[PDB]
Write a protein that binds this ligand. Structure first.
Ligand code: CHL
Ligand code: CLA
Ligand code: CLA
Ligand code: CLA
Ligand code: CLA
Ligand code: CLA
Ligand code: CLA
Ligand code: CLA
Ligand SMILES: CC(/C=C/C=C(C)/C=C/[C@@]12O[C@]1(C)C[C@@H](O)CC2(C)C)=C\C=C\C=C(C)\C=C\C=C(C)\C=C\[C@@]12O[C@]1(C)C[C@@H](O)CC2(C)C
Ligand SMILES: CC1=C[C@H](O)CC(C)(C)[C@H]1/C=C/C(C)=C/C=C/C(C)=C/C=C/C=C(C)/C=C/C=C(C)/C=C/C1=C(C)C[C@H](O)CC1(C)C
Lengths: 158, 193, 68, 42, 197
């Protein structure tokens, strides 16, 4: 009820949208054989969007004055299944990728012409470096602790 | 030291009463800043030390709330009271004027004198009996004032946060209430998180 | 017997010059001309190529730091 | 043989196969969780 | 020593000096010695408290289902009503732990610093070994020898595993794990992770 937004477990315009959608779908459905595979897939999508409407009416989704879901990202973990948990999950994924790439590059830097391994990856070294993602929070942590993450006055060349 | 194991930073080699080696933000790297901080610390602790009993004494004995002692100013016809004595000239303008004149005039004439030791510790005519008799006792009571005043400042912070969480209450009142029943009258109701 | 100026060989140098691509850069000496009539007798290779495609140029000794 | 291995390790083909696998994973998740708007686990 | 892979060579990180070495680092986390120390201490504390927790889960359940006692489930004990409200005991826990654990961390940063009880000067402490504290912790004069540290760490690792199992099985079921064991003994094939999905 944040600023009056009722959940569409209880609102009406949501029910109207659902009704009109399933109605146009059903009216389209009655132009084939009741057993034709296209008609079967049509009914499948009908029940699929129906159970979608049902699922939305199960997870506290505060719902607009026009019959539409509306996220609540204000910080209150009451509505957190939209931003907070998916946000930290994606942050974990992004940190994974960033750390693994950085570690690969730092490793392969020590060769004759690292460009030849930057265009054509050392897929063996790549495979034995890649799964380290589970360390990206902690490892980098220690780096910053030991100051081995940044540099002070080395800018060009290396 | 206040913290065991954590070495004392450079410019905190004791060498001053109250120096238990606590400076995590390193503000004291500047000598002038350091002396100014010492002076302001002494002012702060001394004010708060004088000004906690001015809350306690009324709150318990014949007075009322420490917030209503100034209630005379909110409403027009307010006249202050001495334990049940509305002094003839305890009106708002006269005490306001004496506060202005005395505080400003004095603290000017006193601050404008740069000993600089006299600022933090006035003495002068405020030591004719010689309570500066014993230098050991001197540094000891210095440390004592610093500690007691640090405590008093903590006490004022507590007063503030308590009167915030408990609208319109009294320190002694909340103390007696919580003590009256231990395990369900405390900070818990305030902060689960 | 006359002491040859400039580092000996292989000494990684830090560039002190400002108006080069490698300001605060780590290069490698390849030789120094012992002639005292030169005006830029040291020459340095790099591992990073600049805009003009070149990877070597000249300097005096003042614009060098014999880092190691 | 090893030549074709080093050729296969050239970024275009590696990237194409990696992206194909990732897209397959995503479309399969979407199949097994239609319309997946919220995080209805916690 | 017991490389858990009869063919793989153990990395140089885990030589065998520290107890419980098996070269079990397929991701090369602790290849830096100070971080190795950090994770040693972390494994120690996690294993000790995991042993504690798994005991506090299992033993009450069986003693209640035995009819000798009556005590709610570890998860069903929160809403229970005690002599003290939740928040009270929680804040007391918080202050006491912010003392003890910060002392532990100060010992971690500085070997042999915070030794004495700073209240009284005798009775204080005999110098210790990091991760294995001194007198007032081992009253029975147990000799801190090998086959004691190894047994400790193995039991603690298995305890961690069993605790995670407890937690996830309560998640999927919400029931007492000993009841899961009884249903299991009824028919291990008809009672497993497969049927409950
Ligand atoms: C950190 C480990 C830990 C675990 C696994 C639990 C387990 C639980 N506690 Mg909890 N507690 C834990 C820490 C603590 N609890 C409590 C005191 C309480 C109380 C008073 C209550 C819980 C409740 C709960 C439940 C929260 C509902 C839920 O799981 O949402 C998913 C859950 C079964 C609630 C409960 O039992 O409802 C079933 C409850 O009322 N706990 C204290 C002391 C303050 C803790 C200190 O660490
Ligand atoms: C001490 C470790 C331990 C033990 C004794 C058990 C025991 C049990 N678990 Mg379980 N579990 C564990 C850890 C453990 N789990 C962990 C770490 C997880 C998270 C991955 C799970 C997740 C889990 C689920 C989701 C379910 C069970 C279930 C069960 C019960 C039926 C067995 C089953 O379906 O396969 C267990 C399934 C697993 C995924 C367990 C994997 C454990 C890993 C591989 C380590 C265990 C190896 C160990 C050396 C071999 C067993 C030791 C034992 C003989 C002493 C049984 C009582 C089921 C149940 O309660 O229904 C009756 C069920 O639905 N467990
Ligand atoms: C200064 C901007 C700011 C910041 C940094 C945060 C940050 C945070 N908010 Mg928050 N919030 C904001 C504005 C902000 N919000 C606004 C404008 C509102 C509406 C008036 C809220 C209402 C709000 C609620 C109701 C809650 C948070 C909570 C939280 C925390 C989870 C997170 C740290 C939650 C919290 O305190 O932790 C659980 C929580 O319950 N926020
Ligand atoms: C793992 C490698 C990696 C890492 C750690 C970073 C890190 C960073 N980049 Mg970045 N970048 C990268 C690759 C990387 N980049 C590549 C390949 C490109 C070219 C497409 C860029 C282009 C780029 C721009 C244009 C900018 C940054 C910026 C930044 C900074 C802020 C984050 C940001 O805005 O990124 C936003 C995210 C991206 C730009 C996406 C690039 C990430 C790629 C897709 C990952 C590459 C992984 C690798 C190639 C695949 C191999 C996997 C492994 C098996 C080897 C941060 C320091 C910003 C900055 O200056 O901040 C101050 C900025 O303006 N980056
Ligand atoms: C106001 C105020 C000011 C200006 C200072 C100023 C200073 N404090 Mg201080 N302090 C204050 C309040 C203040 N304190 C309060 C309220 C407490 C109690 C929480 C402390 C507890 C404290 C400790 C424990 C220490 C200082 C120290 C210092 C010095 C660094 C500096 C002169 C350090 C010092 O050298 O003492 C003089 C030091 O070790 N302060
Ligand atoms: C109970 C705490 C306490 C302690 C230990 C001290 C201790 C001291 N005060 Mg003191 N003082 C206090 C509270 C305290 N004061 C309060 C609440 C006020 C108001 C003052 C006002 C005050 C003045 C005005 C003077 C002292 C002076 C002194 C010192 C010389 C004797 C001594 C270190 C004298 C000084 O300058 O020390 C040399 C001095 O002139 N104090
Ligand atoms: C100087 C010590 C001191 C003392 C004896 C008290 C005394 C009291 N406070 Mg309190 N308080 C203080 C400082 C103090 N306050 C300060 C500095 C703060 C701000 C950080 C607070 C913030 C505070 C809150 C938010 C609450 C109390 C409450 C209370 C009451 C019972 C709980 C208690 O003992 O507080 C605990 C005191 C501390 C944790 C201060 C630190 C003590 C160190 C060791 C000195 C009681 C009247 C509660 C109350 O009235 O019940 C509803 C309550 O909700 N206080
Ligand atoms: C918090 C728990 C924890 C911690 C801190 C450690 C820490 C350690 N273990 Mg260990 N271990 C654990 C749990 C843990 N273990 C459990 C539960 C088992 C049984 C499955 C084992 C089995 C095991 C073996 C067999 C061996 C070790 C070894 C080691 C040491 C070197 C490996 C390393 O760097 O791991 C660091 C670990 C981490 C930083 C944990 C990171 C978090 C990960 C991602 C958790 C995995 C997913 C999780 C379930 C969610 C190190 C001191 C080796 C050693 O040197 O012995 C002396 C060794 O031979 N452990
Ligand atoms: C499983 C675990 C960690 C496992 C980590 C592993 C295997 C890591 C393995 C690796 O890193 C290595 C080795 C090498 C890498 O190359 C490979 C990987 C794989 C990356 C920790 C669990 C750790 C689990 C712990 C610490 C559990 C503690 C439980 C407690 C304290 C219980 C408390 C309670 O039960 C009581 C006491 C009373 C009840 O009423 C209430 C509550 C509160 C529930
Ligand atoms: C009597 C009475 C009664 C009536 O009725 C009413 C009235 C009027 C109200 C009253 C009173 C009055 C008065 C006088 C008052 C005052 C007070 C004060 C002064 C306070 C302070 C107070 C003050 C205070 C606490 C202060 C505090 C401070 C602090 C903590 C700080 C800290 C720090 C330091 C050191 C440094 C580092 O590195 C950092 C930090 C951490 C930052």
């Amino acid at each position: 009820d944040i600023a009056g937004l009722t959940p569409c477990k209880e609102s009406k315009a949501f029910a109207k949208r659902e009704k009109q959608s399933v109605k146009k779908l059903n009216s389209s459905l009655k132009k084939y054989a009741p057993d034709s595979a296209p008609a079967l897939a049509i009914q499948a999508t009908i029940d699929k969007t129906k159970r979608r409407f049902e699922n939305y009416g199960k997870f506290g989704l505060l719902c607009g004055s026009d019959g539409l879901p509306h996220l609540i990202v204000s910080g209150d973990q009451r509505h957190w299944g939209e931003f907070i948990t998916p946000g930290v999950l994606f942050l974990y994924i992004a940190g994974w990728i960033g750390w693994v790439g950085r570690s690969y590059l730092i490793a392969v830097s020590g060769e004759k012409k690292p460009a030849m391994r930057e265009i054509i990856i050392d897929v063996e070294l790549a495979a034995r470096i890649i799964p380290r993602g589970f360390i990206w929070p902690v490892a980098a942590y220690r780096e910053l602790i030991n100051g081995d993450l940044v540099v002070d006055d080395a800018d060009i060349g290396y | 030291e206040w913290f065991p194991g954590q070495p004392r930073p450079a410019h905190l080699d004791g060498s001053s009463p109250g120096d238990f080696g606590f400076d995590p933000l390193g503000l004291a790297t500047v000598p002038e800043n350091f002396e100014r901080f010492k002076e302001s610390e002494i002012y702060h602790c001394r004010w708060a030390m004088l000004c906690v009993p001015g809350v306690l004494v009324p709150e318990a004995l014949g007075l009322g709330n420490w917030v209503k002692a100034q209630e005379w100013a909110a409403l027009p016809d307010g006249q202050a009271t001495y334990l049940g004595n509305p002094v003839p000239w305890g009106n708002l303008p006269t005490i306001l004027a004496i506060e202005f004149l005395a505080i400003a005039f004095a603290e000017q004439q006193r601050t404008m004198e740069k000993d600089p030791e006299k600022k933090k510790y006035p003495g002068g005519a405020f030591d004719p009996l010689g309570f500066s008799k014993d230098p050991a006792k001197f540094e000891e009571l210095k440390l004592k004032e610093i500690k007691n005043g640090r405590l008093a400042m903590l006490a004022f912070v507590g007063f503030c946060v308590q009167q915030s969480a408990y609208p319109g209450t009294g320190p002694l009142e909340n103390l007696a209430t919580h003590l009256a029943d231990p395990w369900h009258n405390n900070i818990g109701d305030i902060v689960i998180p | 017997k006359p002491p040859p100026r400039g580092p000996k060989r292989g000494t990684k140098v830090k560039i002190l010059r400002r108006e080069s691509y490698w300001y605060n850069g780590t290069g490698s000496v390849v030789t120094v001309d012992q002639d005292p009539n030169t005006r830029y007798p040291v020459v340095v290779r790099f591992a990073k190529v600049n805009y003009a495609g070149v990877s070597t140029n000249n300097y005096a000794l003042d614009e060098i730091k014999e880092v190691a | 043989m090893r030549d074709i291995k080093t050729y296969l390790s050239v970024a275009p083909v590696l990237s194409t196969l990696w992206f194909g696998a990732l897209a397959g994973l995503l479309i399969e998740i979407n199949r097994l969780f239609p319309d997946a708007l919220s995080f209805p686990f916690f | 020593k017991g490389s858990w892979l009869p063919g793989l060579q153990s990395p140089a990180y885990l030589d065998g000096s520290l107890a419980g070495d098996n070269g079990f680092d397929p991701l090369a986390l602790a290849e830096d010695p100070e971080d190795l120390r950090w994770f040693v201490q972390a494994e120690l504390v996690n294993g000790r408290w995991a042993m504690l927790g798994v005991a506090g889960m299992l033993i009450p359940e069986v003693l209640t289902k035995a009819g000798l006692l009556n005590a709610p489930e570890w998860y069903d004990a929160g809403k229970e009503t005690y002599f003290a409200s939740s928040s009270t005991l929680f804040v007391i826990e918080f202050i006491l732990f912010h003392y003890v654990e910060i002392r532990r961390w100060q010992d971690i940063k500085n070997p042999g610093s915070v030794n004495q009880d700073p209240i009284f000067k005798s009775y204080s402490l005999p110098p210790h070994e990091c991760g294995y504290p001194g007198s007032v912790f081992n009253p029975l004069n147990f000799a801190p020898t090998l086959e004691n540290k190894e047994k400790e760490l193995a039991n603690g690792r298995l305890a961690m595993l069993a605790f995670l199992g407890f937690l996830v099985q309560h998640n999927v079921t919400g029931k007492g794990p000993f009841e899961n064991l009884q249903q299991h003994l009824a028919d291990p094939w008809h009672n497993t992770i497969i049927q409950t999905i």
